[PDB]
Ligand binder design. Structure first.
Ligand SMILES: CN(C)[C@H]1CN([C@H]2CCc3cccc(F)c32)C[C@@H]1c1cn(C)c2ccccc12
Length: 358
């Protein structure tokens, strides 16, 4: 990777999120979204390092602060869609062509820290909240499918979550130091999703009933000793980080325990490796993977990038490379690889954007 360009957004506030559109069409340029201040902005990547500015959505509320974005597509038309959310606790579904807000969702109106789309169903949107809960939405029928909470759920802000390969289960994490597993392939949850698709408020009298899921299928506080701010599945394994200069690769149970045989009472975890780095000991820093999960990237609080090659026989054998530029000195909150892994974008606390090409 070589640094080919940079720019800075005019608001001078942190860029909290960046996402390439992995649903961009054949023959079209690569496009990414950034979120920070009260805005979302789209850019196109072009030759000779060009980062072409397109158009923003700016929230009507000057005090909104967007924290997260995620791409999907319209399941009927195929056109890409962009979901954004943050401090106001309002999910906005944005038409990226025109930057129009198509529709919006409110749960209880508390800050949303992350959004994720289901890997198999483009209508299923997961939000994680300052109010300690996760929420699963069906953005086709505009229904709240389930709330994941209760006293056995998270006890402080939820900071991150991720679906596994097939979207059968979710791992969440947050300020309570815990990582929690929630199965969504239970008979109850499969039925709830089916019912959400059958719901049309114009054709019935009932409100749509959301599931209240009050018991995770696994929980641990044994991986990290501070706020857990990023989690991703790697097959049946988990990658997660806190502010302790480490991404830990771990699994529930003992070494030979099948993820799908793990009981809610499971008291053990197995550590398969740990990727250490430097100067990333502030809260709220995300790592990202490429589409194929061959590579892992994380920025630190002084503008350095770490990239791990995961194409090795066991997690602890990952090969690290580092990327620095003398002008890039601000904290990198998130990175995003293009779908083909040819471009890596980093976004920063000073509203700067850095493009690395290979
Ligand atoms: C808990 N919350 C106070 C945080 C969470 N953070 C989201 C976006 C980035 C991120 C990364 C990993 C987990 C995350 F949850 C988040 C937004 C919020 C925030 C509000 N300001 C004013 C901040 C200033 C600096 C850093 C974070 C913030």
């Amino acid at each position: 990777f070589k640094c080919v360009n940079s720019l800075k957004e005019d608001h001078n506030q942190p860029l909290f999120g960046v996402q390439f559109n992995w649903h961009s069409k054949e023959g079209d340029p690569l496009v990414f979204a950034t979120v920070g201040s009260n805005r979302v902005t789209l850019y196109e990547c072009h030759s000779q390092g060009e980062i072409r500015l397109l158009q923003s959505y700016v929230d009507a509320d000057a005090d909104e602060n967007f924290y997260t974005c995620a791409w999907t597509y319209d399941s009927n038309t195929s056109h890409p869609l962009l979901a954004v959310a943050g401090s106001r606790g309002i999910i906005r579904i944005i038409n990226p062509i025109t930057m129009q807000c198509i529709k919006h969702y409110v749960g209880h109106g508390n800050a949303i820290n992350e959004l994720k789309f289901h890997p198999r169903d483009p209508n299923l949107l997961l939000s994680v909240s300052k109010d300690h809960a996760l929420r699963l939405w069906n953005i086709q029928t505009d229904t709240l499918v389930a709330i994941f909470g209760g006293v056995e759920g998270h006890r402080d802000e939820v900071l991150s979550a991720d679906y596994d390969l097939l979207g059968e289960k979710i791992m969440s994490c947050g300020m309570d130091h815990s990582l929690k597993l929630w199965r969504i392939n239970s008979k109850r949850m499969m039925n709830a999703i089916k019912e959400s698709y059958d719901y049309n408020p114009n054709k019935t009298n009932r409100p749509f009933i959301s599931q209240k899921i009050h018991f995770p299928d696994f929980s641990t506080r044994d991986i990290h000793r501070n706020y857990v701010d990023c989690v991703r599945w790697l097959g049946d394994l988990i990658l997660s980080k806190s502010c302790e200069n480490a991404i830990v690769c771990w699994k529930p149970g003992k070494m030979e325990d099948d993820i799908d045989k793990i009981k809610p009472s499971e008291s053990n975890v197995t550590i398969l490796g740990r990727f250490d780095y430097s100067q990333c000991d502030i809260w709220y820093m995300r790592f990202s993977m490429d589409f194929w999960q061959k590579m892992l990237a994380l920025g630190n609080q002084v503008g350095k990038l770490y990239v791990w090659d995961l194409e090795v026989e066991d997690p602890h054998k990952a090969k690290c490379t580092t990327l620095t530029h003398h002008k890039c000195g601000a904290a990198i909150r998130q990175t995003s690889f293009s779908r083909d892994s040819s471009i890596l974008i980093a976004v920063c606390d000073d509203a700067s954007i850095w493009r690395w090409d290979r």
